[PDB]
Structure formats: structure tokens, C-alpha cells
Amino acid sequence: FGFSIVLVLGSTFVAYLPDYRMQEWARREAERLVKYREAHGLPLMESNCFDPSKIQLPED
Amino acid sequence: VVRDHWIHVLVPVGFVFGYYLDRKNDEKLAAFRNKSLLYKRELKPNEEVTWK
């Protein structure tokens, strides 16, 4: 009850489980989005992550 | 047959009791069921739940 049922079972538990930080999900999402942006001609990672038309800058 | 050792039975009973109490606590905190704005659908497909 320390090795034969704890150690190897926890080893196989941590060896594969649903991925932290949705990691493989993030991989497939990034593949889909990069294929999208390269299909629609615009450069991938358009900067200014929030809408500059939808901002209200306090002027000087 | 159980009275040979009534001692070793105790802590899985404690764990199952705590798990049941956590499920009852989650039932007590069952607001915003389909009222969320991202994980939203109707009462579908089977019967009127999205988590229980």
C-alpha cells in the first residue's frame, strides 16, 4: 500500500490525464487559426489586441 | 462478518460522506445554470440539466 498500489498507479495516472492549460487544445486551436489567417491573406498576429476604433483615449 | 475489524472501514466511509456533502453543496450553489454567456444552451438533449 505504498508502492504496488500507490506509486505505479499514481505514475500511470500522471503519465496521461486531460492536458493542463488545455495544451493540445491550444495546439489545435493555433493550427486552425493560423491556417485561417493565412487563408484570408492578412498577417497572423495582428497587433493591437483590442479594437483601436473601440477605444476612448483621454486627449491632452 | 464486518465485526472482525470495524476499524479499517472508517476512512472510506468518511471520504464518501464528504464527497456526498460536496455534491450537496454544489446542489446548493446551483445558480447560473444556463444563464452563462459562453457555455450556454437550452434544456437539451435529454432532460433539463447541464451539470448535476
Binding site: L7, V14 | P12, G18
Partner: protein, 459 residues
Amino acid sequence: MLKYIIPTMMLMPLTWLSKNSMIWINTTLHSLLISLTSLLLLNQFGDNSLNFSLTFFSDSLSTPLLILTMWLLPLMLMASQHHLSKENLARKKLFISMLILLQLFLIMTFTATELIFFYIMFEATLVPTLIIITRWGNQTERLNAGLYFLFYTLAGSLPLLVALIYIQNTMGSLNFLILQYWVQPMPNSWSNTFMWLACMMAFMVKMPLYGLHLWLPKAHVEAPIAGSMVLAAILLKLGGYGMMRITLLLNPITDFMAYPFIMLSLWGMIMTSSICLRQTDLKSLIAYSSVSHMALVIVAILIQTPWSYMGATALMIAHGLTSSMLFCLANSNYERVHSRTMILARGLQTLLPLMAAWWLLASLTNLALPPSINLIGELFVVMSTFSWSNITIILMGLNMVITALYSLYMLITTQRGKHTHHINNILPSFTRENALMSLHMLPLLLLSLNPKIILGPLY
């Protein structure tokens, strides 16, 4: 998590209403079952932490530390025989129940909702370790050690409560979620400086930093093995955990007022590595090793890079395992000869042949074993601090050289060169010590395989 708290309440009267020669197996077995039960914890994913209740929520900073605590309990509960076998059954039950109550307040401490609850369970962690080390200290100044311990940890940790009530009545509730959403920069006044110094100084005292680390050597040379390992691993890394949570607020002034703590941390790390290079009393060498590694942790906290936080939590978990193992090695040496010194027990390559494998492996883990978690932590902290300043790598590498040096001298003083051929009372290597070492080091190598668990919330 409440399903992790409530079997610990069920584990306490197990010790009481189990009979003679029946308490031991039941406690060990069932606490290992709890180690399985919270090995089932790690559901944490993506955007947020796993957050269940007004009572509970767990980060992936809190996740490996909580797993480490519940894993370190039964190992310790087996480790603390041979010095209370001749004691009373009732006093033995009191000892084991005090350990279980201490674990319960550790879990309470790690899964706190508001930081008030964290503080209550923080000094609740503080109280029973005193009783453990004072009732079974086994050296004449356990008086002085417990007195220093409680006074430093209270009187450093005392204005923290005032500052938390002040943050309560200035920004609404103190839950970590809304405080994560309702932070705002509190600029360079002087009251902001006092409040920051209060909170950070309380956890500084808990680490300890170099300025008042003096309670820590006495608290490891004048303590039994159980309180020593709980103290070092869980309490010091709990202080680091607490600083990690509270440092989310008070961002704008840390550039102004974070310089001197970095200074005392770096120069005291170098001086601590110097002072452990020469001393006898082998048990204390691990304590000053802990002071050096936690000075490195403190540098890693006060520089504020996600690289730095991931390396910080890696160094936390790695030094917890390494220092607990090395404490149990020193306890084995103290069971062999009744010395606690460093130059008396020599030889031990002939005698106890596979004990040498564990001393070598422990000095490797202190030595930054090249795929170990210790090296991962030290390496990423050096990366982030070389980003922070291009000249501080000199002190880091000088720490590295002296760290390798004193770890190697700790090895070859005891287990290299000549058996003294007058001791003639050592028993052969028990299966207990080797069992405890297999319980220590197989999880360390498993975490060395896939360390995506032990990296923190900024993974």
C-alpha cells in the same frame, strides 16, 4: 477538498480507538489511502483554478504543495519510531494525533479562501510543532529553540493581521478572486511603504531571510525528525506560498522598496554558504542548506517574472523533498551513533553498502543533479535574475560553486576515508531506512520525468 479535510477528522479517533500494536498499521495504511485520494485532486485546467466553494479553491501553486504535504505525512509517521517505542501508549497516541492535527491545519492553510482564514490557519500551523519539538526535543536547549521559534514567528507575523484588516476595510472582501480583479496601484506614500513592509516582513520572517534566520538552526538541531521535516519542508515553503499569494497586490512600489531585501538575500545566501562550509554538527548543515535555498527562493519571489515564479515553485518542491530525505539520513546516523556531530562517525563505505547509494543520491540532489527539479529551479531563477540584472550572475554562480562544495564535503566527511574501528555497535542497515528512502526518491525521479505538474500557475 472538504472530502480531503473530513477523512483527516476521521483519522484522529482511529489512533484513539485502535488498541495496542494496532494503531500503527491503521494510521500508516489510511494516511497512504489519503495520499491516493488527493493524488486524485489534479483536475486543474486552462483559464482558472479549480474553485469549489465559499470554503475552497485550489491553484496549481497550492496543488503540488498539498500533494507534497499529504505524501510527506505517512512517510514521516513511519519515520518517527525507534525513539518512542519505549514510551507510553497514551503519549504515543498523543504524538500521532498531534501530527494528524498538524496535517489538518496544513491543508486548511493551503486551501484558504480569504487571507484572514489563511492567517488563522497559519498560526494554527505554528502552534502544535512547538508542542512536538518541546515534548520530544532530546537536547537540553529545546526550551530555547521553541521559545525563539514562537516569539520570532508571532512577533514577525503580528502586523500582518492588522494590515489584512486594513485591506479588508479599504477594498471590500479579501477573497483572492475579487482581489485579483480589484487590485489598483497604491503609489509611493509612506503608509504604503509601512503596509508593504508589514506583510512582506511577516513572510520574510517565516522563510526565514538572512536577517533573523537564527531560530532555524536550533529548531533543527534540537527537534525530533517529524517536527524537523514538517518544519523545514511544509512551513518554510508555506511561507513562500503565502508571499506568492499576497504579492499580487501592491505592485507599484516594489520597484522603489524591493532593493534592500534582494541585497540581504543575496549577500546572506553567500554568507550562509560560507558558514555551512566549515561547521560540525552534521544535522545543522541541512538547516543552513535550507537557508541558502530559501534565500534563492526569496530572490525569485521579489523579481516578478513568470520564469521566476515557475523556478521558485520548482525549487520549493525540490528542496522540500531533498531536505526531508537528508534529515532522515542524519536521523539514521544519529540512531547508529549517539553523536549528532560530524567528524566522529566516519567510514561507512564498508559498513552499510547501499546506504552509500542514498547518501550519494541525496548529495546529488543538493548538488543540482542535472535533470533534477532542483537544477530546474536554480536554473530558471538564474535566467530571470540575469534578465533582472546583468551582473548578479556572479553571486549566483559563486553560490553554485560553494553549494557543490559543502554538499560534497557533507558526503565525504561521513562516508569516505576510514572507519574509526572503535565504535562497534552499529546494527546493519534496516529495511525501514531503505524503505523510507525508496519512499523519498522514487517520487522525486517521477517528477523529474514529467515536471509539467510542478510548474506553477504561470505554466
